[PDB]
Amino acid sequence: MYEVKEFSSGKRKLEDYKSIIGEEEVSKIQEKAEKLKGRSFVHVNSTSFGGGVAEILHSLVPLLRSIGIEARWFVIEGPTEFFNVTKTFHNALQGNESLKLTEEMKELYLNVNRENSKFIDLSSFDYVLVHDPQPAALIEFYEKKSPWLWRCHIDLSSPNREFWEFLRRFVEKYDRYIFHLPEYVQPELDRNKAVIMPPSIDPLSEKNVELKQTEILRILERFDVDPEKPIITQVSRFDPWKGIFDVIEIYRKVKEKIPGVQLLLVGVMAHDDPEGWIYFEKTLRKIGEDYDVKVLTNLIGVHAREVNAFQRASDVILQMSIRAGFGLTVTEAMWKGKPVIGRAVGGIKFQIVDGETGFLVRDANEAVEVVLYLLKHPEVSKEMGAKAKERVRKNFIITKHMERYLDILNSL
Numbered sequence: 239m240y241e242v243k244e245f246s247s248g249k250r251k252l253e254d255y256k257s258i259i260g261e262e263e264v265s266k267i268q269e270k271a272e273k274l275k276g277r278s279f280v281h282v283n284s285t286s287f288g289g290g291v292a293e294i295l296h297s298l299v300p301l302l303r304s305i306g307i308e309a310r311w312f313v314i315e316g317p318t319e320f321f322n323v324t325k326t327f328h329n330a331l332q333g334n335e336s337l338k339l340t341e342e343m344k345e346l347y348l349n350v351n352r353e354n355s356k357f358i359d360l361s362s363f364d365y366v367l368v369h370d371p372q373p374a375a376l377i378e379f380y381e382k383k384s385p386w387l388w389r390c391h392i393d394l395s396s397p398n399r400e401f402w403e404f405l406r407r408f409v410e411k412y413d414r415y416i417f418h419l420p421e422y423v424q425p426e427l428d429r430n431k432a433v434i435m436p437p438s439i440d441p442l443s444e445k446n447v448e449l450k451q452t453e454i455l456r457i458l459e460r461f462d463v464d465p466e467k468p469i470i471t472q473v474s475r476f477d478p479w480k481g482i483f484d485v486i487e488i489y490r491k492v493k494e495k496i497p498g499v500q501l502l503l504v505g506v507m508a509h510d511d512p513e514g515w516i517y518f519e520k521t522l523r524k525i526g527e528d529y530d531v532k533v534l535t536n537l538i539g540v541h542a543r544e545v546n547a548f549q550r551a552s553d554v555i556l557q558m559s560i561r562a563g564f565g566l567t568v569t570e571a572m573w574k575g576k577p578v579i580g581r582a583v584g585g586i587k588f589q590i591v592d593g594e595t596g597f598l599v600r601d602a603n604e605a606v607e608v609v610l611y612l613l614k615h616p617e618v619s620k621e622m623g624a625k626a627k628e629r630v631r632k633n634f635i636i637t638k639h640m641e642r643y644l645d646i647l648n649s650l
């Protein structure tokens with residue numbers, strides 16, 4: 239078990255968002271953090287590099303620090319055989335009931351947890367937070383002296399029975415279990431001690447920071463995207479259930495009345511995800527030689543800062559997922575003042591206030607209607623965008639995230 243001590247984000251402090259959330263709120267935050275001044279608030283997880291959770295901590299910890307809370311972050315060390323197992327665990331908890339949990343696995347998992355537990359005494363801290371499966375087992379390698387929290391960043395509505403009965407021996411121990419949505423909260427747990435904490439976006443990260451027009455245009459020009467013509471965009475992983483083919487249909491139908499429209503299919507996927515890459519090849523083959531459709535991914539060098547650009551340069555953003563988690567991509571768009579059009583699924587129905595900040599549609603043709611409405615009425619779009627931005631400022635910002643945590647430490 240290692241510690242971060244540092245933070246890529248830098249010396250993030252509540253103050254760095256004063257301009258964004260206003261002083262009344264900066265205060266309301268500081269206040270709720272006084273009652274917890276000098277307390278120990280540690281975070282444990284499986285990596286400080288790859289991942290959003292990791293990216294969230296690099297900003298979240300510093301913040302907690304600069305507000306009066308001795309926040310600290312520790313990571314878990316392990317051999318490949320441990321992460322491949324946790325990958326399975328991961329995929330198992332998120333359905334895929336074709337996975338088998340063996341003893342060689344439980345032993346490995348539990349052992350790795352034992353070892354990393356003898357490096358730093360976690361029971362000593364006023365508050366301990368454990369992120370995702372990998373370090374769940376930790377909770378039974380110390381005598382509890384303070385509350386322990388389980389943070390879930392995945393779906394637990396339809397988990398592989400075998401695997402859940404095993405993890406549940408650890409999760410049930412913690413004082414409160416935190417989930418993104420009131421759907422991931424397995425029944426084997428006591429809803430009284432469960433907590434709903436949607437994830438959040440950090441306004442000052444590569445993905446959400448405000449770029450300067452010149453850079454947006456450099457990126458637009460680099461990937462051959464015309465900022466002078468209309469643009470619709472769906473940022474998302476490439477898989478069978480993200481509505482990607484529907485989007486392609488929507489773009490085509492819209493293109494009948496607006497021949498200049500361009501479609502941006504944006505998406506960063508890890509190299510160890512053949513599933514995603516096969517759906518990627520499939521997309522391109524369906525798109526055919528229509529270069530008004532841009533398929534942008536990290537294979538061609540698209541990353542957070544470029545994704546940032548594609549989103550900002552967009553006139554309308556889509557999210558036609560058939561099955562979805564929280565949908566941070568929807569959150570990012572909403573933050574960039576863009577009106578989203580998407581299916582009422584997972585976190586997309588929770589974030590979009592239909593008719594106010596964007597639209598919730600049931601099919602592709604309904605999505606076509608609205609893409610034209612919005613494209614036809616830029617001022618309406620501007621409005622929905624402005625409201626979508628506020629909703630985020632007031633609900634899904636990393637500072638509102640922290641405040642939520644505070645609310646939780648003031649209820650134990």
Ligand SMILES: O=c1ccn([C@@H]2O[C@H](COP(=O)(O)OP(=O)(O)O)[C@@H](O)[C@H]2O)c(=O)[nH]1
Pocket residue numbers: 290445473474475476504505506507542545562563564565566567
């Ligand atoms: O193609 C992608 C897919 C995801 N993300 C990042 O991953 C987060 C969204 O994860 P998501 O909510 O889409 O997971 P899901 O809810 O779909 O299971 C966002 O913050 C993005 O920065 C990205 O940049 N490009």
